[PDB]
Design an enzyme around this catalytic site. Sequence first.
Site: not given
Ligand SMILES: */C(=C\C(=O)OCC)[C@H](C[C@@H]1CCNC1=O)NC(=O)[C@H](CC(C)C)NC(=O)c1cc2c(OC)cccc2[nH]1
Lengths: 294, 300
Positions: B40, B142, B144
Amino acid sequence: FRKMAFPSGKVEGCMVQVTCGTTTLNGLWLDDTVYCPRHVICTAEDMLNPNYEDLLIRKSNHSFLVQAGNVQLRVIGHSMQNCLLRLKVDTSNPKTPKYKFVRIQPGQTFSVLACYNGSPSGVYQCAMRPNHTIKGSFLNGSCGSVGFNIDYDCVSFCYMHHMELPTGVHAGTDLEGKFYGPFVDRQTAQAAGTDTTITLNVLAWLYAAVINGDRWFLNRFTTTLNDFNLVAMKYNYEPLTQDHVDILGPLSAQTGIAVLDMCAALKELLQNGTILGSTILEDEFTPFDVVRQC
Amino acid sequence: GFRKMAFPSGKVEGCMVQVTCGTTTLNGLWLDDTVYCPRHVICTAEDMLNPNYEDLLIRKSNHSFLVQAGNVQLRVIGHSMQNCLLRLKVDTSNPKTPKYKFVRIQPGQTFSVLACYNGSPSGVYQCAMRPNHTIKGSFLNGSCGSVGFNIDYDCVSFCYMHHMELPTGVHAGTDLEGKFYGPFVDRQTAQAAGTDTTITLNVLAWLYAAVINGDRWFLNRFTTTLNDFNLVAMKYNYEPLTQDHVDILGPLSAQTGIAVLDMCAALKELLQNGMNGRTILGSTILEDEFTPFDVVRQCS
Ligand SMILES: */C(=C\C(=O)OCC)[C@H](C[C@@H]1CCNC1=O)NC(=O)[C@H](CC(C)C)NC(=O)c1cc2c(OC)cccc2[nH]1
Ligand SMILES: */C(=C\C(=O)OCC)[C@H](C[C@@H]1CCNC1=O)NC(=O)[C@H](CC(C)C)NC(=O)c1cc2c(OC)cccc2[nH]1
């Protein structure tokens, strides 16, 4: 909000083993000095009440086997500083981080890198209790393991392990070899003073609860710091200092709850008796730990 | 003593890098000449709502990726998608790459998490793979690309790479082959996990750790067969205990002198009566995130 250790890599690169005879413990190699507990020079006959000064007279630089793995680091000097030995070695550790030696106060948290034979085995978060002990997890061979904090790539070393009290709690020194608490480095059963609850950390845990929306315990009252301290001592809680209120500044500003208004809520909880899922108030998470992982 | 203890993280810290695609940045793991990271990273905020990853990936070239190890840029010379991860081939090999394996961990097993932000390690803690294939971690924006691992004699077994936080606050991620643990997908959608169960083998290991540390109040003369214990365990949403699991508890049973089935009978009473205001190892609930291996490592 969770209990976490600092990444230990900067400390792992400093761990060595120090052996005298058949007795091996851990040492901390920073630049050209190795720091380690002085009881490494003891035999089973000296341990009851060692005369460290007299024992050190019969030790020379060539008596100390210092190893980074199986690689020997030659000792070119030795001195005693309180309950530690400072062994000067002929190689400056290239993995030495930016560091400081700090003497922590009760309530403060730190990570411990448990080591055996100079080999790190695990890392966990600890708090210095008001009775100057830590509730650690150590086995035989763990002495010389260190406690530390990392702030902006600088490692503040605060603890070096030396003893397990009869109650199972642990005792050790700062990196100048001075014990936390009234303990001594000899093979005797030593009791710690009666422990108290860490008031500063319970208040932080309450703010962390408010930050997440758990705020049922707040009230429309306030208290003076002195009146809170008088009530707290009746409940086995530590008194609050002018510094404690100042460190609570960030959390107070964030939630809009004045420190003294929070003490009134904690004072009502002590007099009358869930918060963040638990029936008991957590006391090993500092205000910095709450602010840091917000 | 008894605490949650993580593996020393240094071998993993030396592998952490930052991966950036446009304005999206996350963590990557640099092993030899490859950087692994969540796919992603190729998404803009809008793409994340409903991504067609193959379409998004064909629109990128090697120059679209910016990989930084500390403050040094690593040149991307190849890219491919492996399930929910990207494999970026770089022009240099990481000299700090430890001896390693990639493993798909089974539910009930524990691992250490090195939480990283912008390629920089921030904290290390222990997690268990829940039976419903989620982990109860601590991750912020941040994080991930942060990884989970175990260490066995200088060898790092990587088992987890972080991708998502569910609406309940628990976490979802993949193994290092890019396959999610559980029925989760990498899109910006609210997702639920299956109903969770308690890891029985771990609760029993933790009760043995309590006895080793002087907490014995829950022991009694009650006895049970393996089947009668499992009937009660299933009634309380606990996993059945197999003979293989009974065998695993052998060394803890020998160290304490408490027969496995006798510890099962103690657990059966604790489920049926509760703890009655009492605590076990400073906990008001039955802890299930310590394996028998985690107990022996700390208690012997
Ligand atoms: C890590 C992504 C990252 O670092 O990207 C940098 C730009 C995050 C980790 C999350 C953030 C808060 N705590 C965590 O563990 N991952 C994400 O945000 C996911 C991205 C996806 C895989 C593309 N998304 C989610 O975890 C996510 C999305 C949603 C919703 O939507 C609408 C609604 C509810 C929950 C939720 N969780
Ligand atoms: C570290 C010593 C070490 O690593 O030496 C290498 C050969 C241990 C740390 C202990 C061991 C078990 N868990 C720990 O935390 N320290 C010691 O064993 C102390 C040595 C002293 C400083 C010479 N001693 C004790 O901790 C100790 C001695 C006694 C008693 O005696 C009698 C009685 C009760 C408790 C107790 N604790």
